[PDB]
Design a protein around this ligand. Structure first.
Ligand SMILES: [O-][O-]
Ligand SMILES: [Cu+2]
Ligand SMILES: [Cu+2]
Ligand SMILES: [Cu+2]
Lengths: 77, 276
C-alpha cells in the first residue's frame, strides 16, 4: 500500500505528495512542479536531488529536496 | 592506458586532464554523459528493470560508462587517462584533489557555489545545463551532509565479502556489490556522493568532474575484490527477469555484456593493484 498523501508549506514552499523515468507509484510536487522520487525495497525514499541518501518517507524526500534547493525553482524532469 | 591515483598526477597531467574535460564540455559532448546517467538513475528501480544502479550490473555498467568517457577524453588528448580518487586515503578538504589547479574546493556556505578551480562558474567554462535544481553553477559542500568519507578498514570489510551479489539483486541485497554501492552496510559509494554534496548528491552527479574519479576508484575496488576472490564471479548467470545476467547485453550500448567487462586489463591497468 502506498503512503498517505500530504500537503504542507515547508521553508516557504508548497510540497505535496500523492499516490499515483520509472513506473513509480507516488508523485511529489514542489510549488507545483513534479519532483522525481523513488521508493527503495526497504521502504525508504530518495529524490532526484538526493538520490544517494535514503530517508524514511516521501514527505522526508520532499523536505530534503527543498533543503537542497535553497530557494531555487525546480525544473521539470 | 594506465589509470593513476589522482594524488600522484604531475602538474602537466592535471593541466592536460582539465583541458580535455573542458573541451568535452565546450563541444557539447560532456552534457550527454550527464543526461545518460540521470536517465538510468531515474529509471533503475528495485522492483522493475534495473541496469545502471541498484543491481549487479552497477559495476560493469559504470565500467563501460567510464570507458566511453575516457575514450572521449582521449579523442581530445590521447595522453589523458582517467585518474581515480582513493577517498579512504585522501579524505579531507585539504587533499590536493580539491586545490585550485585541479578540481577546486568546496562551495561557499550561502549557496554552495564553488568559487575556485577550473570548474568554478565564474570562469565561464562550466555551465550546469543538464539539471533539475535550476541553478547553473557547480556546487559542493564537502563533508556537509555526512561527516566522514569511508576509511580503509571499512573498505576492507566490504572487500572481504565473498559473494558478488545475491538475490533479490537490488538495493536490499547482501553481498559485495550492494555493500560497495552502499545501500546496505557501512556504505561506500553512496556515502561519497553524499559527502561531496552539490550536484554529486543528485541524479545529475556527472556534472561534477569528481564523479569520474570517484567511479574510477569504485571500479578499482571491483578489481581489488576480484583479486581477493579469484574463485568468485559475477552473478546472476542466466534467466533473471529485470536484471542483466552475465551474458546478457546492457543498455544503452546494447552491444556489450557484463562478461565482456569483468577483466579490466583488456582496456587499462592501474598504477598499482595488489596481487592475490
Ligand atoms: O551513481 O553515480
Ligand atoms: Cu529514482
Ligand atoms: Cu554513483
Ligand atoms: Cu588464493
Amino acid at each position: 500500500a502506498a503512503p498517505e498523501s500530504f500537503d504542507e508549506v515547508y521553508k516557504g514552499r508548497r510540497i505535496q505528495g500523492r499516490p499515483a523515468e520509472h513506473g513509480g507509484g507516488y508523485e511529489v510536487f514542489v510549488d507545483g512542479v513534479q519532483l522525481h522520487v523513488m521508493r527503495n525495497a526497504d521502504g525508504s525514499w530518495i529524490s532526484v536531488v538526493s538520490h544517494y541518501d535514503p530517508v524514511p518517507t516521501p514527505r522526508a524526500a520532499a523536505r530534503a529536496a527543498v533543503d537542497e534547493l535553497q530557494g531555487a525553482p525546480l525544473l521539470p524532469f | 592506458t594506465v589509470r593513476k591515483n589522482q594524488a600522484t598526477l604531475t602538474a602537466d597531467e592535471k593541466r592536460r586532464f582539465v583541458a580535455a574535460v573542458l573541451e568535452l564540455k565546450r563541444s557539447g559532448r560532456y552534457d550527454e554523459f550527464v543526461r545518460t546517467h540521470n536517465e538510468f538513475i531515474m529509471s533503475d528501480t528495485d522492483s522493475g528493470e534495473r541496469t545502471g544502479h541498484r543491481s549487479p550490473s552497477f559495476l560493469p555498467w559504470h565500467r563501460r560508462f567510464l570507458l566511453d568517457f575516457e575514450q572521449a577524453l582521449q579523442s581530445v588528448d590521447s595522453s589523458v587517462t582517467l585518474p581515480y580518487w582513493d577517498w579512504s586515503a585522501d579524505r579531507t578538504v585539504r587533499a590536493s584533489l580539491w586545490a585550485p589547479d585541479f578540481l577546486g574546493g568546496t562551495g561557499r556556505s550561502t549557496d554552495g557555489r564553488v568559487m575556485d578551480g577550473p570548474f568554478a562558474a565564474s570562469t565561464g567554462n562550466w555551465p550546469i545545463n543538464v539539471r533539475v535544481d535550476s541553478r547553473t553553477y557547480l556546487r559542493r559542500s564537502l563533508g556537509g551532509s555526512v561527516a566522514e568519507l569511508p576509511t580503509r578498514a571499512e573498505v576492507e570489510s566490504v572487500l572481504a565479502i565473498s559473494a558478488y551479489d545475491l538475490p533479490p539483486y537490488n538495493s536490499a541485497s547482501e553481498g559485495f556489490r550492494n555493500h560497495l554501492e552502499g545501500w546496505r552496510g557501512v556504505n561506500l559509494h553512496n556515502r561519497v556522493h553524499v559527502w561531496v554534496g552539490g550536484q554529486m548528491a543528485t541524479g545529475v552527479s556527472p556534472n561534477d568532474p569528481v564523479f569520474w574519479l570517484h567511479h574510477a576508484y569504485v571500479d578499482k575496488l571491483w578489481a581489488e575484490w576480484q583479486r581477493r576472490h579469484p574463485d568468485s564471479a559475477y552473478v546472476p548467470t542466466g534467466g533473471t527477469p529485470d536484471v542483466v545476467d552475465l551474458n546478457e547485453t546492457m543498455k544503452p550500448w546494447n552491444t556489450v555484456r557484463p562478461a565482456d567487462l569483468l577483466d579490466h586489463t583488456a582496456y587499462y591497468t592501474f598504477d598499482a593493484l595488489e596481487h592475490h
